[PDB]
């Protein structure tokens, strides 16, 4: 497929170790500001969509508003304690709800919360 000017639009990747150390220093600087805090946020267990990937789960975007309520975690406090919220996703089944509520109670057991000021 060398029909166009391939020479003027060729990208080389000699900075692949250079981008790697820059990426690690970004994670390093993120935990410098958020020192006791983790570097990421809680994501729910989500089932992959198509019939090819029905039998494998993955990490989704955020928790359902019903999933926060069943676990006893308030919705306007959840982003402040490191839990991602997604209002677009719905449960549609008790198995998706029960798996993610159990995940939120496990996060609740492992959590150390500090009192304001």
């Amino acid at each position: 497929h060398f029909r166009k000017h391939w020479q003027r639009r060729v990208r080389c990747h000699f900075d692949q170790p250079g981008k790697k150390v820059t990426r690690r220093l970004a994670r390093r600087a993120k935990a410098a500001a958020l020192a006791p805090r983790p570097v990421d946020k809680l994501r729910p267990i989500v089932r992959c969509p198509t019939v090819k990937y029905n039998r494998r789960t993955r990490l989704g975007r955020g928790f359902t508003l019903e999933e926060l309520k069943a676990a006893g975690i308030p919705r306007l406090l959840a982003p402040t304690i490191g839990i991602a919220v997604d209002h677009r996703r719905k449960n549609l089944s008790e198995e998706s709800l029960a798996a993610n509520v159990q995940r939120l109670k496990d996060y609740k057991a492992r959590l150390i919360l500090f009192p304001r000021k």
């Binding site: 993120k30 410098a32 304690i81 609740k108 150390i112």
Partner: protein
């Protein structure tokens, strides 16, 4: 190119920019993490020694060995098996290990000052005028226009009187 050739010929200093970054690479202060942070170690072995978790996602590669930094019933309801219409909204009621972890639970569960809120001088004067006229009958204070112009419900005044101390 014509820029750089001019500087070589010129008797003007090359302005050497110091290595300043936007984001600091290390924590700072007089907190527990800042005192126990090792500059030479990386994030994962720092949080290993602290006893904490850095990443809550799925492990994206092989980790170093020993890091521990990357993580009857009638109605068939699965929620009932997981149990222990409003909840508390500004805090969460919560029920051989590393020293930094032991410290972090200590300032977590240390006693905190209440810092109570008082009523204003006009508010206690408004209630003091009300109790002297009617008394302990909170119903009549709700339906009296001249000393309750804001027309507040008797249960609200009862709750407000309890804060003042008057019955």
């Amino acid at each position: 190119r014509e820029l750089q050739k001019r500087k070589r010929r010129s008797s003007r200093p090359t302005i050497r920019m110091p290595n300043r970054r936007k984001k600091a690479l290390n924590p700072a202060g007089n907190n527990i993490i800042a005192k126990s942070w090792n500059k030479k170690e990386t994030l994962s072995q720092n949080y290993t020694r602290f006893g904490l978790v850095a990443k809550l996602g799925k492990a994206t590669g092989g980790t170093a060995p020993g890091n521990k930094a990357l993580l009857s019933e009638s109605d068939a309801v699965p929620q009932q098996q997981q149990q222990e219409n409003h909840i508390r909204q500004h805090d969460l009621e919560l029920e051989s290990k590393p020293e930094v972890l032991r410290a972090l639970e200590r300032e977590a569960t240390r006693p905190v000052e209440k810092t109570v809120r008082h009523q204003s001088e006009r508010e206690r004067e408004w209630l003091q005028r009300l109790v002297d006229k009617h008394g302990d009958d909170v119903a009549a204070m709700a339906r009296d226009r001249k000393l309750n112009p804001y027309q507040q419900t008797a249960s609200d005044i009862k709750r407000r009187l309890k804060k003042a101390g008057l019955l």
